[PDB]
């Protein structure tokens with residue numbers, strides 16, 4: 001795919017879907033910044049892999065649920081590269097229980113760490129992308145955020161709020177060509193029963209949806225939610 | 235409308251949409267419980283207005299965002315009336331501001347107040363209504379939670395999260411006939427009215443009647459739905 | 470429920486969900502006009518049952534897919550009645566098959582009969598309700614129109630078209646206080662399927678009928694262009 | 706973007722959005738079949754321009770609303786190329802008028818011509834793509850099929866029916882790996898006012914959204930309605 005931008009920051013990218021987004025975007029020629037919070041071994045391993053395939057990769061440590069930490073990280077990337085073309089808000093956790101077994105503590109943890117991180121990222125994207133009249137931001141949402149689930153009142157709250165907040169951000173960034181969109185993965189690798197495509201999704205399929213929404217090919221799409229769930233939910 | 239249930243708790247019912255919801259359900263024979271946080275001047279005045287007109291009304295206290303406070307009023311109401319049929323999560327604030335001028339303080343205040351509160355309400359509705367195999371909960375969301383708005387990242391996050399959480403709760407309470415539903419009002423009382431097909435602002439009372447429908451027996455097969463009351467502003 | 474308006478025409482009302490809308494609206498004091506197409510007997514039995522129960526009811530024969538018949542029937546009701554306050558486009562057919570087995574014949578029949586009929590209904594409603602600045606029209610759609618279904622390309626086409634056309638009609642009727650809304654029933658009783666319904670049961674026809682009543686009644690005076698899901702959680 | 710398949714038919718592709726879709730899919734390596742009904746001038750001009758630019762391109766004459774005539778066209782393509790990997794139902798007309806002024810003739814014309822044609826395309830796609838267990842179909846709908854518009858009861862009916870029928874076809878084709886998806890463009894080159902991106906859309910951005918949905922990058926996406934409207938509707 002074709003990118004006018006040059007670099008991308010991916011929160012929570014040391015493993016899983018975030019790692020695969022990093023891998024996909026770096027194989028398409030963007031310099032990927034791979035966020036991690038705790039142990040650096042796995043992030044450093046991914047960065048080494050990506051350079052060793054010939055790509056551009058750097059690692060950066062911050063807590064995406066911390067305002068100061070994540071503002072200073074974006075400032076450091078601006079100072080190293082000259083700007084920031086792309087952001088992927090992927091940082092997220094799960095703490096599933098039935099609601100009657102869930103303290104407001106278990107709710108606040110998931111809400112803060114899944115929504116406020118995305119809010120910080122989107123606001124800082126608005127700041128650093130405005131001067132150049134160019135940017136794209138993708139919020140990794142979920143199918144749970146669109147339909148809800150048993151035992152996932154907190155998670156579904158966070159990712160439905162992410163879907164609606166992202167549209168608000170699209171409204172605010174659209175006049176300076178700063179686009180915001182959500183991706184709602186389905187089941188990514190019994191549950192396979194209800195999937196019409198009769199298989200789990202690969203992380204790469206998510207990653208290439210993200211790549212499309214960051215790319216120039218989606219330059220008229222903003223404020224949209226892209227389902228990547230094999231037909232589980234239309 | 236027809237109600238098998240007997241009483242309702244309405245958070246933030248002292249004025250505006252909450253109070254006129256309260257008037258509405260009282261007029262249809264339900265015992266209303268106005269909930270307030272600060273002054274009891276308007277809440278008491280409402281309560282009295284509702285009892286002169288011949289209706290059953292009382293008041294109760296908590297910060298609907300406070301877990302303990304919320305819970306403990308719900309036991310108080312169960313002990314007074316023998317149960318709680320209906321709940322309306324109406325409590326909510328706005329703190330509008332462009333996102334770049336918005337401290338995460340201003341974001342947490344709105345999230346914690348507007349959606350954690352609805353979480354305590356819904357989770358406790360599940361608890362008190364499960365025994366009796368009957369219940370109906372309506373969460374008062376907004377068109378902003380469906381479409382988003384400039385200057386309302388915090389409010390749209392809270393209300394959209396409510397709308398989705400409501401669906402999860404509907405899942406958890408469906409097997410026991412506890413129904414969960416949301417209402418998304420539009421602009422409720424000139425350039426604003428240009429984009430409303432009905433060409434007018436909504437009365438707080440139209441929102442209240444939609445809430446009554448979702449609480450009544452007439453919606454007994456409707457759970458997990460989001461009912462748009464916006465005069466056509468959003469379809 | 471409260472109704473400012475006085476009478477209602479329900480298309481396809483001689484049996485099933487339409488008969489239950491007629492029964493429910495009759496019991497709320499509306500004069501119901503029960504439409505039928507072919508054999509009257511079942512329709513006149515419904516009219517007699519409603520009149521015995523103390524309610525107002527009449528029958529009227531016309532083909533909802535025929536522009537002239539449906540025009541002329543609405544004109545007749547306006548002249549018996551003084552006007553027409555409420556309309557329920559309930560007429561619909563199914564011809565389920567897989568698409569590779571479906572002729573275009575089998576597609577137009579369901580389209581011409583499920584959508585065009587609603588189009589005529591809503592357009593005549595606009596006409597006859599404009600002067601009095603009051604009116605409410607409900608279009609009986611389906612969950613299939615929202616979600617799509619195997620073997621139901623034609624039916625889902627017709628009901629999704631109905632759902633979107635109903636919103637356009639809301640736009641055109643909104644200035645004369647003529648509201649347009651849709652109901653999307655799920656699986657209604659007439660047990661593999663009850664699996665995927667959270668409420669763990671089929672719906673009753675009366676639950677649909679009461680949702681229709683709400684969308685006709687005064688209580689929904691600010692709700693227009695909406696699609697009200699009656700499916701017990703099968704689709705959110 | 707990559708494509709496992711080799712060719713694509715596009716109905717109503719002689720000018721406008723369909724021409725741009727032909728132009729875009731041609732530059733990415735697909736052999737494009739340019740459908741037209743009436744004059745062949747403009748379609749030959751398109752063909753000659755794409756063959757000038759080094760690409761494979763062929764015109765084909767048929768009325769998309771006629772069952773026999775678009776079944777036969779698909780059959781002739783199958784015989785020439787050996788198969789058909791991709792289809793784009795783009796044929797479409799408007800006859801805008803207030804509902805009280807609109808004969809059922811006016812309604813039937815737009816219905817028969819916008820929605821029946823897509824039905825004939827999607828069934829025939831089911832038939833010809835099933836054996837190879839590979840295919841992708843994109844139905845070009847509209848924002849009007851999602852929110853409605855005054856004066857456009859007929860167009861909105863056709864396009865919203867297209868959007869729901871496409872999910873039904875997605876269900877039917879899922880097991881064979883034949884994907885169905887819709888595109889809902891907004892305003893495509895006062896009005897601009899209500900568009901957050903503050904400009905009309907290029908046919909070119911619609912065409913690239915279509916390309917993504919046909920491509921291998923959307924291989925876990927079926928039954929989706931991808932909005933291309935610059936924030937005009939979220």
Ligand SMILES: NC(=O)c1ccc[n+]([C@@H]2O[C@H](COP(=O)([O-])OP(=O)(O)OC[C@H]3O[C@@H](n4cnc5c(N)ncnc54)[C@H](OP(=O)(O)O)[C@@H]3O)[C@@H](O)[C@H]2O)c1
Nearest residue numbers: 012016017037063064065090091092140141142185187188
């Ligand atoms: N897999 C699915 O089916 C599915 C579908 C829907 C969406 N997604 C989304 O996919 C994303 C991650 O994919 P995954 O399921 O493969 O999860 P995963 O394997 O847990 O990867 C999540 C990553 O995000 C990190 N993270 C969490 N909070 C963070 C913070 N505040 N700052 C920085 N990094 C943070 C992780 O925590 P640690 O430091 O603890 O490793 C981890 O590296 C999330 O947004 C999830 O909500 C998942």
Ligand SMILES: NC(=O)c1ccc[n+]([C@@H]2O[C@H](COP(=O)([O-])OP(=O)(O)OC[C@H]3O[C@@H](n4cnc5c(N)ncnc54)[C@H](OP(=O)(O)O)[C@@H]3O)[C@@H](O)[C@H]2O)c1
Nearest residue numbers: 246248249250251297298299324325326374375376419422
């Ligand atoms: N009006 C609209 O256009 C619109 C549309 C969408 C939905 N709604 C919803 O309508 C509801 C209220 O209607 P309104 O707009 O008319 O607002 P309002 O006039 O401000 O009434 C809101 C009430 O909720 C109370 N409240 C706030 N937080 C509370 C808490 N934690 N515990 C208990 N009570 C609390 C208020 O606070 P005080 O103690 O500070 O008075 C006040 O009595 C909200 O949920 C809002 O989100 C508004």
Ligand SMILES: NC(=O)c1ccc[n+]([C@@H]2O[C@H](COP(=O)([O-])OP(=O)(O)OC[C@H]3O[C@@H](n4cnc5c(N)ncnc54)[C@H](OP(=O)(O)O)[C@@H]3O)[C@@H](O)[C@H]2O)c1
Nearest residue numbers: 481485486506532533534559560561609610611654656657
């Ligand atoms: N049952 C469900 O699960 C379900 C769910 C979604 C919505 N609905 C909708 O419910 C409505 C009817 O309910 P039902 O399922 O109980 O169907 P039903 O039992 O078949 O009742 C349908 C009625 O509509 C009549 N009708 C058909 N075309 C007509 C026309 N052109 N003019 C006048 N009447 C016409 C019937 O035809 P005859 O003269 O041939 O009897 C019959 O009386 C339809 O709109 C259907 O599309 C059904």
Ligand SMILES: NC(=O)c1ccc[n+]([C@@H]2O[C@H](COP(=O)([O-])OP(=O)(O)OC[C@H]3O[C@@H](n4cnc5c(N)ncnc54)[C@H](OP(=O)(O)O)[C@@H]3O)[C@@H](O)[C@H]2O)c1
Nearest residue numbers: 717721722742743768769770795796797846847890892893
């Ligand atoms: N432009 C927009 O703002 C917008 C937005 C939403 C979607 N779209 C969709 O985009 C498509 C067309 O793009 P456009 O707006 O640029 O329209 P256009 O300029 O009119 O191009 C439409 C083409 O489709 C052809 N066509 C119509 N019916 C046909 C049939 N039965 N068989 C074969 N070809 C047929 C045309 O007819 P002739 O032979 O009469 O030339 C013409 O070549 C349609 O599906 C329209 O509904 C338009």
